[PDB]
Ligand binder design. Structure first.
Ligand SMILES: OC[C@H]1O[C@H](O[C@H]2[C@H](O)[C@@H](O)[C@@H](O[C@H]3[C@H](O)[C@@H](O)[C@@H](O[C@H]4[C@H](O)[C@@H](O)[C@@H](O)O[C@@H]4CO)O[C@@H]3CO)O[C@@H]2CO)[C@H](O)[C@@H](O)[C@@H]1O
Ligand SMILES: [Ca+2]
Ligand SMILES: [Ca+2]
Length: 418
C-alpha cells in the first residue's frame, strides 16, 4: 500500500485504493444491531476479494424516524444525536471488534462522518447545544438555502438542524471525535457527508488536525443548476464543480460527473466523467462508483432509496469501466455480496491489480468504433477495454501483443491485457 499525497497534496493515499462501500440503505432494518458482527465475520473475505479499504456506516447512534406516505426511514446514521457508538449497526464493543478484524486483514476502515447537522430534537442524547450561542445555523437570519452568518454552506432541508461547524466549539468537538475514531476505532480515513453543507476548507482543517496522512473523500452531489445564476458554477460542468471542491478540501471527491453521464448519456459519453480527464491532476482525485446507498436500490423495504439507479443492463459495463480506469473505484455492497456480480467484480479487481492501474494512469478513447473503446496505461500492463462495441481485435486500436482478460455478456464486456 503506497501511501502519499498527490502532487497537489490531495489525500488520495498512494492513488492505489480499491474501496468497498460496506453497507446498503436498509441494513438497520434487515440486520438490526447485527451489521458489525457480519463485517467481523466477513473481514477475511473482503480482504481476499481484493479491497484495500472499506467505507463504514456512520458510527454515531441514530434513533431517528420519519414517514412520508409509503416511505419510511431512520436510524441509518445521517441524523445522529450523539457520538455514542451503540446504535442500530451494533454496539461499541462489536464496532471495535469489527474494525480490528478488518484492520488485521489489511483493509483500512473509513468512517462516514456527518458534521452538517444532528438530531437536535432527540430528547435523550449526550450532546446538548443550546440556542442563542451561535452553535446553530438558525441562531442567525436564515433567508434561504444559501450560506448565512451561522453556517457557511447550504442547509439540510429546513436548516433547523444545521450546525455552525465554523463555531470554535463545534469545530473543536468534531475534531476531537475524529481523533477518537483514529485512536480507538482504527480509522484509516473518512468519507465526509453532505459536503455542500459547509466550507471545503473546513475539511482540510479537520484532516490536518486529526489524520493528515489518511484517505478522505467528499460526497458532493450538487449540479450546476443548483448554484445561483450569478455563480460561475451555474454554468460550469459537473467536472469543474467537483474538482473545485477537491482543490479546497484537499480530498478526493465522488465522481458525480461520471455518474451523470452514466444516467443521462450513452456509454460513449462515459469518457466525460472526472476520471477520464486528460490532466492527471484532474482524473486522480476522482472517486468512481456505480451506485451508492442513495442512488441505488437496496434489499428490503421500498427497494431502499434508488434516487438515480443504474439499470441492470449496464451494471457489468459500469463495473468493467470503473475497475479498469483511472481514479479510485468504489464497489457497492449489494452488487458484490447480494446480487451475484461478486465473481465478475473479483475478476476485474484482479485485472486492475495485475496491470498496475492507479488513480493517475493514462486513458485514451478510440473514436472509430461503437460503444466505449479505451486504452489504459497501467504501470505493469496496457489494457484495451471495449464496451458494447463493434471492435474486432485489440490490435485495431493499440500496439502490442494482447491476451483476453475478460469476456462477458456476449462480448459486450471485453478486456485485453498486453
Ligand atoms: O430536522 C431537519 C429536517 O428534519 C426532517 O428531515 C427528514 C427528511 O425529510 C427525511 O427524508 C430524512 O432524511 C434523510 C434522507 O432521506 C436520506 O437520504 C439521508 O440523507 C443523507 C444521504 O444519505 C447522504 O448521502 C448525505 O450526503 O446527505 C443526507 C443527509 O445527511 O439521511 C437523511 C437523514 O436521515 O430524515 C430527515 C430527518 O429525520 C424534516 O422533514 C425537515 O423539515 C427538517 O428541516
Ligand atoms: Ca494506498
Ligand atoms: Ca450547513
Amino acid at each position: 500500500d503506497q501511501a502519499g499525497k498527490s502532487p497537489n497534496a490531495v489525500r488520495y493515499h498512494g492513488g492505489d485504493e480499491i474501496i468497498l462501500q460496506g453497507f446498503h440503505w436498509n441494513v438497520v432494518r434487515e440486520a438490526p444491531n447485527d451489521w458489525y458482527n457480519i463485517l467481523r465475520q466477513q473481514a477475511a473475505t473482503i480482504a481476499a476479494d481484493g479491497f484495500s479499504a472499506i467505507w463504514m456506516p456512520v458510527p454515531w447512534r441514530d434513533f431517528s424516524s420519519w414517514s412520508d406516505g409509503s416511505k419510511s426511514g431512520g436510524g441509518e446514521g445521517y441524523f445522529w444525536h450523539d457520538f455514542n457508538k451503540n446504535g442500530r449497526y451494533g454496539s461499541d464493543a462489536q464496532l471495535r471488534q469489527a474494525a480490528s478484524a478488518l484492520g488485521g486483514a489489511g483493509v483500512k476502515v473509513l468512517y462516514d462522518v456527518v458534521p452538517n447537522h444532528m438530531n437536535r430534537g432527540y430528547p435523550d442524547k449526550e450532546i446538548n447545544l443550546p440556542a442563542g450561542q451561535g452553535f446553530w445555523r438558525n441562531d442567525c437570519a436564515d433567508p434561504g438555502n444559501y450560506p448565512n452568518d451561522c453556517d457557511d454552506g447550504d442547509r439540510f432541508i429546513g436548516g433547523d438542524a444545521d450546525l455552525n461547524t465554523g463555531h470554535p466549539q463545534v469545530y473543536g468537538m468534531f475534531r476531537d471525535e475524529f481523533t477518537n475514531l483514529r485512536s480507538q476505532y482504527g480509522a484509516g480515513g473518512f468519507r465526509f457527508d453532505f459536503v455542500r453543507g459547509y466550507a471545503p476548507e473546513r475539511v482540510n482543517s479537520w484532516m490536518t488536525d486529526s489524520a493528515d496522512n489518511s484517505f478522505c473523500v467528499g460526497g458532493l452531489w450538487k449540479g450546476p443548476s443548483e448554484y445561483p445564476n450569478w455563480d460561475w458554477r451555474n454554468t460550469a460542468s459537473w467536472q469543474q464543480i467537483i474538482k473545485d471542491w477537491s482543490d479546497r478540501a484537499k480530498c478526493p471527491v465522488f465522481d458525480f460527473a461520471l455518474k451523470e453521464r452514466m444516467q443521462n448519456g450513452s456509454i460513449a459519453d462515459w469518457k466525460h466523467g472526472l476520471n477520464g480527464n486528460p490532466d492527471p491532476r484532474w482524473r486522480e482525485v476522482a472517486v468512481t462508483f456505480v451506485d451508492n446507498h442513495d442512488t441505488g436500490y437496496s434489499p428490503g423495504q421500498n427497494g431502499g432509496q434508488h434516487h438515480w439507479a443504474l439499470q441492470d443492463g449496464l451494471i457489468r459495463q459500469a463495473y468493467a469501466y470503473i475497475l479498469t480506469s483511472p481514479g479510485t473505484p468504489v464497489v457497492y455492497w449489494d452488487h458484490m455480496y447480494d446480487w451475484g456480480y461478486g465473481d465478475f467484480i473479483r475478476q476485474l479487481i484482479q485485472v486492475r491489480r495485475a496491470a498496475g492501474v492507479r488513480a493517475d494512469s493514462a486513458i485514451s478513447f478510440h473514436s472509430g468504433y461503437s460503444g466505449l473503446v479505451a486504452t489504459v496505461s497501467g504501470s505493469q500492463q496496457t489494457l484495451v477495454v471495449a464496451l458494447n462495441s463493434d471492435l474486432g481485435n485489440p490490435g485495431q486500436v493499440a500496439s502490442g501483443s494482447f491476451s483476453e482478460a475478460v469476456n462477458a455478456s456476449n462480448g459486450q464486456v471485453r478486456v485485453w491485457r498486453s
